[PDB]
Amino acid sequence: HSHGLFKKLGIPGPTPLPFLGNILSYHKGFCMFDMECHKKYGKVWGFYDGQQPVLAITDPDMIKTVLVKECYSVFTNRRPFGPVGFMKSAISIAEDEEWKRLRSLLSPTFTSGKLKEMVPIIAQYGDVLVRNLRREAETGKPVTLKDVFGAYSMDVITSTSFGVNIDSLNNPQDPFVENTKKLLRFDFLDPFFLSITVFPFLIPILEVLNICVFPREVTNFLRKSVKRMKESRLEDRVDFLQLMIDSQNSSHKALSDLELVAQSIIFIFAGYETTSSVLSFIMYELATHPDVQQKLQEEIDAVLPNKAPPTYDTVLQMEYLDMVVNETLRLFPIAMRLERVCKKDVEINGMFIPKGVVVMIPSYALHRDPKYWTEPEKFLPERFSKKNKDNIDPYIYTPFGSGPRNCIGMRFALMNMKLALIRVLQNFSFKPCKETQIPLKLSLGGLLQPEKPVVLKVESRD
Amino acid sequence: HSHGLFKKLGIPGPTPLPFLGNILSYHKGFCMFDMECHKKYGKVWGFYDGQQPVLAITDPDMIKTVLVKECYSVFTNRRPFGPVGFMKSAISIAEDEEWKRLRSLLSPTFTSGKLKEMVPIIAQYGDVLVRNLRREAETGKPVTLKDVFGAYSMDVITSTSFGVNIDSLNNPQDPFVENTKKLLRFDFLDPFFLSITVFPFLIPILEVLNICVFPREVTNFLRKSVKRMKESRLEDRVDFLQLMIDSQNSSHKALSDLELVAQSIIFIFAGYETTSSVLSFIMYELATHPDVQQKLQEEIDAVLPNKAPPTYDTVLQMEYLDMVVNETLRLFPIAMRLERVCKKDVEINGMFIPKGVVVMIPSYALHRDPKYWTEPEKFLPERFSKKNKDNIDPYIYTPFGSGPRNCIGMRFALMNMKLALIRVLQNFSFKPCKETQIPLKLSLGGLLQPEKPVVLKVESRD
Ligand code: HEM
Ligand code: HEM
Ligand SMILES: CC(C)N[C@@H](CSC[C@H](Cc1ccccc1)NC(=O)OC(C)(C)C)C(=O)NCc1cccnc1
Ligand SMILES: CC(C)N[C@@H](CSC[C@H](Cc1ccccc1)NC(=O)OC(C)(C)C)C(=O)NCc1cccnc1
């Protein structure tokens, strides 16, 4: 059973039911379960996802050893979560030596250099986003942000990774738009993924029936799509695909054709719903904190007078904008948790850790700990002012994780989201509607997302 | 193992491999496997779908006992085929007493009476089909029949079962059109369904993970869609839904709300790809047999002079049209086989049949038997002339099965397909293109469908 393990080592936690372990306590979501545990049990605790032991840790020293010092030797991989098919070769899923080789063949894709190159592409779709917004702003109808930010996020994905150029909002039925919309963030508390936790032995079975968590058709579409573009650019700069094609010419072992496809898909999956979700959470805070929206709009006009177009350099110039983005990510860190599988009997910061345990960092709960954040629930961007940004522990605030396996798309994600904000706020202000949910409720599911979706009023600064 | 059963009873057949049984012999498809067996082995034979024994029978007496005389007592159900979820309640899947109750609450829906009522609806989409065809006939581009007949078939389904009215071809992106297109005939020789045959014990497992062969979203869409229409017509004639709603007012036990949904879905699944597939096979024969198309066009003009609109009565008037439809269904009976599970030790026409065996009628192969059809591969509509239609055994030619469990949608299916043909042939002629596959090859898969899809030239009789 292994349900005696934490009781032995002296670690506290909720008592597990047979077979289910502690999963019935997810009825209120990971976020509410994690805070409770931190409160009830202290700096460390333990629980069981079925029979799999999970050790939670909240001490910044312990957290650093795990994600940095002993990342290569001990805590290199994440927990498997379901049948993956050929997506086993995607960087975020791959393990150990395959992972290290993959992370290397793809890191130059995410340098500040290649990213400054991509700025003018992502900018062009700032414009598209505006026109589409004004069309809803010239017709005084409340607006669903995720719909319009999704269309933008999508637009940016297609171009920055394949060269394809569509305003998805107006071609909602373009093939390259349909498949991609199906690529939604996995709800790890829906019937299926729960069942996987009760029956992880079911995972092999499903794999032998080529059942996949990435719908077989979406993937089949993109593979040939990629294997077509591969053989249309070759032969006839500047997207993720080309960067990867260019890499399997001129670790090591180059990148396989199918390995290349899986990375294409993962970048899509990672960047789509996330970008659009964070952008929604930020407009929710700007509409319910009018000062902050006004202070930010003023800042944007000074750097970019005359609605001047944002550039890479003038984006990194804006401090309040960076403050606002970070404080949103504090209150809504959409990964919720960080996790590593401990692959060896180990002892770190004076605590034994037996093989196979899952080490977990409860990010959401640390972001709202009163022991590090005064008034943690209030939206106060000044926590991140260059005055106070020094009193913030990088192992307490980790919206992109930390260490060698942190978010590879971090710089890009922030740059994408900020370009969107600048062009939007150059043009509109955003006001609560009667139908706006104040104060926002987080979904009880396994996603950090709003219970009810965000709807606001949008007015032209003209 | 049970792999000794046929060897014992004195029945011949191919030797089964361990675990796989005879399935490796499906590499050429059910149709080619069935003919071979009939040839090699005679009037009866046996084989194993994994460990499940299947007895084939080709004697018309034996076939009648099975589908008619002993249908209620012995051969009431079909073989399960995969995880079905809530679609377990659909008539074609349900079993025994539930089946008999369902077949009864739905039979009045398929009377000649209700069907004559539906004629003017299905006719209106004959017109739509024309306009769309002429648009491709005024632009001399070869035409893919299944695309244009699919759009028609779809159009007819939506209206005859929910009142919805769209020209799907031009609204290819209407929600009510997207879901329905996913409802495609199951390929019982793709990786998944084969695996089910090797691991039928996997079926329970999949059911406990709410995995379904009817994609959970399509079904989720229609349920609420139906539960909306149910509560918009009620309260504010003339489709399958209303007929079923009217039935759960004024066997017995009425029809449950969820039972009603499953029938809605099955009619869609049954009528969509089938109608469009048969209609394609018929235009393939009319284009490669120009006499027959001309003789039929002449017949239509005499009954309906001046492109007069077809009616129920003038449709049943047309004999050559009926001949042509039937002879197509002979060469392409798209179910391929009929099957019943023997639920008891039984002895019929002097042959023992142990419990649990699957009794199978190899329709495709009987339709092409030289022992009943001279020149079986030739397309000769005169086999069905009212002169020779008496020399045809109803248990050899069974495109809709036979007995209490035969195709409930038969009259409707024929009437739909004939209305389509009349309106089309009143207006166009259909000629081979260079890119037409002559002679058509049947797919080696588990569907009766063309290897390559049918493309023809379409000319206005104007
Ligand atoms: C607001 C946007 C995003 C947020 C908040 C976010 C957050 C995270 C977090 C917390 C992790 C886990 C880090 C760890 O385990 O320590 C992660 C991993 C990852 N992210 Fe993101 N992410 C975002 C957008 C993106 C984008 C746009 C990409 C585009 C390529 C991307 C690619 C990845 C990859 C590939 C990994 C796994 C890396 C590895 O295992 O080596 N992410 N992300
Ligand atoms: C060209 C069109 C069609 C052909 C060739 C066809 C053929 C067949 C065949 C061979 C069977 C099995 C009969 C048996 O087991 O003896 C069947 C069953 C069935 N068909 Fe069709 N079919 C067609 C269209 C339709 C349509 C339009 C509907 C619309 C409602 C429909 C509804 C059903 C149902 C419900 C069953 C199962 C009945 C029961 O189990 O009681 N079919 N069909
Ligand atoms: C393979 C994929 C399905 N599983 C992850 C592996 S990476 C860790 C993720 C990151 C994440 C970030 C934001 C929102 C959701 C998830 N989940 C993580 O919280 O783990 C537990 C749920 C605690 C087990 C993946 O690759 N996701 C692609 C991606 C998405 C978003 C940002 N960056 C990358
Ligand atoms: C539940 C559904 C997935 N399975 C069938 C049960 S009915 C027997 C069918 C009929 C059929 C006709 C034409 C084309 C394909 C199938 N298959 C049959 O050949 O069985 C074996 C494959 C030999 C095992 C169902 O309900 N199909 C709805 C339907 C479709 C078409 C016509 N009428 C009804």
Curated annotation (Swiss-Prot), chains A, B:
Protein's cellular compartments: Endoplasmic reticulum membrane; Microsome membrane
Assigned GO CC terms: cytoplasm; endoplasmic reticulum membrane; intracellular membrane-bounded organelle
Documented effect of changing residue 258 to P: In allele CYP3A4*18; exhibits higher turnover numbers for testosterone and chlorpyrifos
Named cofactor requirement(s): heme
Membrane-related topology note: Single-pass membrane protein
GO molecular function: 1,8-cineole 2-exo-monooxygenase activity; 1-alpha,25-dihydroxyvitamin D3 23-hydroxylase activity; anandamide 11,12 epoxidase activity; anandamide 14,15 epoxidase activity; anandamide 8,9 epoxidase activity; caffeine oxidase activity; enzyme binding; estrogen 16-alpha-hydroxylase activity
Catalytic activity line of the entry: an organic molecule + reduced [NADPH--hemoprotein reductase] + O2 = an alcohol + oxidized [NADPH--hemoprotein reductase] + H2O + H(+); 17beta-estradiol + reduced [NADPH--hemoprotein reductase] + O2 = 2-hydroxy-17beta-estradiol + oxidized [NADPH--hemoprotein reductase] + H2O + H(+); 17beta-estradiol + reduced [NADPH--hemoprotein reductase] + O2 = 4-hydroxy-17beta-estradiol + oxidized [NADPH--hemoprotein reductase] + H2O + H(+); 17beta-estradiol + reduced [NADPH--hemoprotein reductase] + O2 = 16alpha,17beta-estriol + oxidized [NADPH--hemoprotein reductase] + H2O + H(+)
Effect ascribed to mutating residue 381 to L: In allele CYP3A4*13; lack of expression
Effect on the protein of changing residue 29 to D: In allele CYP3A4*7
Listed InterPro entries: Cyt_P450, Cyt_P450_CS, Cyt_P450_E_CYP3A, Cyt_P450_E_grp-II, Cyt_P450_sf, Cytochrome_P450_3A
EC number: 1.14.14.1, 1.14.14.56, 1.14.14.73, 1.14.14.55
PANTHER family: CYTOCHROME P450 3A4, CYTOCHROME P450 FAMILY 3
Illness association: Vitamin D-dependent rickets 3: An autosomal dominant disorder of vitamin D metabolism resulting in early-onset rickets, reduced serum levels of the vitamin D metabolites 25-hydroxyvitamin D and 1,25-dihydroxyvitamin D, and deficient responsiveness to parent and activated forms of vitamin D.
Protein name in UniProt: Cytochrome P450 3A4
Name of the gene: CYP3A4
